[PDB]
Amino acid sequence: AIQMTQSPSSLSASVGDRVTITCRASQGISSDLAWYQQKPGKAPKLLIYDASSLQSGVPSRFSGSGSGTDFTLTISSLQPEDFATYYCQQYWWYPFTFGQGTKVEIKRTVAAPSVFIFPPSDEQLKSGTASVVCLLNNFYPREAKVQWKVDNALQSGNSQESVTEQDSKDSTYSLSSTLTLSKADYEKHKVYACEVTQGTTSVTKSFNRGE
């Protein structure tokens, strides 16, 4: 099958910026390429067909170019409704294949997270498992290092991270890190700490099992 590769996987831009998204095919596909826009929870919307032909109802700031194996999608003046994920698709030969997608996100100033730690509830402990949740609230950019320490012992393999999309108010992200332990392991230890590192700042929020 023909492999489609997009670049970059994600990019941050501002309203009014000129944005260019590249799509490359592993084989020549002439001009049989389409571009799509997709927003969270919605179906994709066709933007361009035949590499350069604009689909009806698509603003003229969207334009496509290229042929063979090198294609580009250009947004001349980025608008607030353009922040979304964009896919290319070849229909040169079966099976039809998509690119992995390029996420166009909102650029903003760096923001440090507000860190909160939540012990497991007494209700959950009666089930036999303990979930310890660390919350990183309203930070930018997306990157952050979160480490769990249980009585100064660094934890690994027993935590999962989840990130929200950019907030509609301040364009920041939020992140949860959930430490999952058995009830027995949780009762055998005292100090539970969540260390969040971003840039030149490390913040450790902790609690002592009992207080």
Q: Could you list the residues that contact other proteins (CB under 8 A)?
A: 1, 32, 34, 36, 38, 43-46, 49-50, 55, 87, 89, 91, 94-101, 114, 116, 118, 120-121, 123-124, 127, 131, 133, 135, 137, 160, 162-164, 167, 174, 176, 178, 180
Which DSSP symbol is given to 199? T
Q: Which two tokens stand for residue 97?
A: 């294949």
The residue among 61 and 205 lying less far from other proteins, judged by its C-beta, is 205
The residue among 77 and 185 lying less far from other proteins, judged by its C-beta, is 185
Q: Are strands 62-67 and 85-90 parallel, antiparallel or unpaired?
A: unpaired
Burial of 33 (0-12, 13-18, 19+ CB in 10 A): buried
The residue among 83 and 86 lying less far from other proteins, judged by its C-beta, is 86
Residues 24/69, Cβ–Cβ less than 8 Å: yes
CB of 16 to other proteins, least distance (A): 28
Q: Is 81 helix (H, G, I), strand (E, B) or coil?
A: helix
CB of 51 to other proteins, least distance (A): 11
CB of 65 to other proteins, least distance (A): 16
CB of 64 to other proteins, least distance (A): 11
CB of 169 to other proteins, least distance (A): 8
Q: In whole angstroms, what is the distance from residue 15 CA to residue 67 CA?
A: 29
Residues 163/175, Cβ–Cβ less than 8 Å: yes
Residues 147/153, Cβ–Cβ less than 8 Å: no
Q: In whole angstroms, what is the distance from residue 167 CA to residue 160 CA?
A: 21
The residue among 17 and 209 lying less far from other proteins, judged by its C-beta, is 209
The residue among 14 and 127 lying less far from other proteins, judged by its C-beta, is 127
